[PDB]
Amino acid sequence: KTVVVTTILESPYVMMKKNHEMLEGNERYEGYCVDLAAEIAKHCGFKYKLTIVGDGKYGARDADTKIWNGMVGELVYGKADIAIAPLTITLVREEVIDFSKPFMSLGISIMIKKGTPIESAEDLSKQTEIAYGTTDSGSTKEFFRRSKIAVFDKMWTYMRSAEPSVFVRTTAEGVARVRKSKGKYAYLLESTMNEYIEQRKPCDTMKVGGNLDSKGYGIATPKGSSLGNAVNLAVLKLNEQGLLDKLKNKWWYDKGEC
């Protein structure tokens, strides 16, 4: 009956309201994906329950274990019926789960502490004084691991050998590292997140260079699930009606700080 929705606490997509301890159920959370979920549910006609991914990961197939983790894993192994969050549509994921057409565009980007002498991925690839890395178990790390493009492959080789580890468990960890490393740590995360944080206090970070790639987020369901078709059409419907646009403007600019 009730659709189990797996998501992740990632501002401004999903976050607990300040007064959450005084609320209940889905009302405890707020954000882009929270509004999106309510929209998808309404158009598809189902009741749902927002649940936070247990391991706090987006999703990757562990090397050796071969087991999928994160929101992808929850879908693959029967823990959730649908994933509504900033989950990147990728080849490896599409092979084990279904994705609706994209509801938002984005690209891998670089976040630096203001003043860091870096302007591009190429700049990063040429040196080591300023360490750089990305988040574990997601599409960004996989991108560098698989890229055959000169600059990116060099960066991957760099990351694997850099000490101490340049990888972080979460976006929060990555951003905190950038802010506390006095310009010696650059973080590779998606443009959506980079731009949001940039316009928020303490206004000490900034996106540099253009995006490294072009892709999108999609709503994911277990492979072959009957929910896919309806969900896919709803997303196209919301986009065509201009709702997804209003949603982004609301969560990315209607609340800016810097």
Add this chain to the structure above:
Amino acid sequence: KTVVVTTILESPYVMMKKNHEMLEGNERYEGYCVDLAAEIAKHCGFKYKLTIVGDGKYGARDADTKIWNGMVGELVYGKADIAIAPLTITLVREEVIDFSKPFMSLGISIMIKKGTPIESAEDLSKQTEIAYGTTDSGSTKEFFRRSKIAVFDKMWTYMRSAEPSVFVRTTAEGVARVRKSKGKYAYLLESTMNEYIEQRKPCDTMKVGGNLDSKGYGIATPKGSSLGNAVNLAVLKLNEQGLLDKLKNKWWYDKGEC
């Protein structure tokens, strides 16, 4: 069995080579979508023949006969196995055929002569001194006809009532009008074409402001087609390897005669 590919003549997507009369088969054609077809065939392992859609339409259902025309029609009625062209993924189409994840992003945009005082659709709707319109048929006009959002509905009512008519028979006519109207005419069309023209002599037009909507072109196949899965994975793979970006640069930015 040779795969029947339906496409449409539209620059710079598909065009007959200047010396086509000296070539044969698929070799007569050139363009972004011709190159794309080659990449997909290679990744999916199939032989194919490029055929040009008979009615020169993209894909719409007649409200009276309920018949689908264009490339979508050829797939719906089983006359072609796959459509590779600048065919936009839409709700109504997704209901009758299958679309791979998008291979190129776009949106309705404004084309102006360099120098005209217009920076957005909002600006256009608030004035009349600078006339603006769309092609007398097609997805852009249909977008405005159906739009329920304030700004666009106002633009539609203006366009429908404006005299002399602000509509043009073809894209070429629209761009010509922009170039000869000394800044008194703005043309609304797909961002992709806008960007292409902006890169060509005489370099007197420019794309301005943000797009009015966000969507993407996708490779289409009949519902339940065995080719669907592979083609979708091929697009994702081509994108992840940076091949799609290289292709756009080849046909848009490397050859930009500006």
